[PDB]
Amino acid sequence: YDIQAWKKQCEELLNLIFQCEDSEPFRQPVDLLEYPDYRDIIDTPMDFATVRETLEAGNYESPMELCKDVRLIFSNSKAYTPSKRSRIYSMSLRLSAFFEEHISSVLSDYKSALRFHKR
Numbered sequence: 001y002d003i004q005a006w007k008k009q010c011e012e013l014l015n016l017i018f019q020c021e022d023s024e025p026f027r028q029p030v031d032l033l034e035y036p037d038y039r040d041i042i043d044t045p046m047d048f049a050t051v052r053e054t055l056e057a058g059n060y061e062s063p064m065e066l067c068k069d070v071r072l073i074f075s076n077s078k079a080y081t082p083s084k085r086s087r088i089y090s091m092s093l094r095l096s097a098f099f100e101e102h103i104s105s106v107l108s109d110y111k112s113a114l115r116f117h118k119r
């Protein structure tokens with residue numbers, strides 16, 4: 001029933017993601033010199049360094065808001081890929097499965113703690 005516990009749980013999960021080789025393409029914003037038409041296709045760029053800085057600034061109120069930005073990293077990968085078989089897209093699908101496996105208990109514990117506070 002700790003309403004604040006999600007923040008350190010999300011810091012530790014970001015640490016595991018940065019250590020994962022599959023996160024390499026997603027650790028910084030997409031480079032617009034490497035991909036000159038990027039912003040014609042992607043309206044809201046997102047990356048793991050931006051999510052980590054947003055958390056450390058105190059600019060997420062819940063783990064649901066963090067989860068929405070991490071899912072945007074993966075939906076941007078799917079929208080930019082030329083093929084469902086591409087290397088960077090295949091890295092995003094494995095990292096998405098790993099993220100979803102670990103975030104479900106963070107979300108459940110937070111929502112349970114808020115229900116207990118309002119009982």
Ligand SMILES: c1ccc(Cn2ccnc2)cc1
Pocket residue numbers: 025026030035076077078080081082086088089
């Ligand atoms: C597939 C999916 C996405 C991209 C763009 N991009 C490059 C690095 N991280 C994302 C390239 C190919």
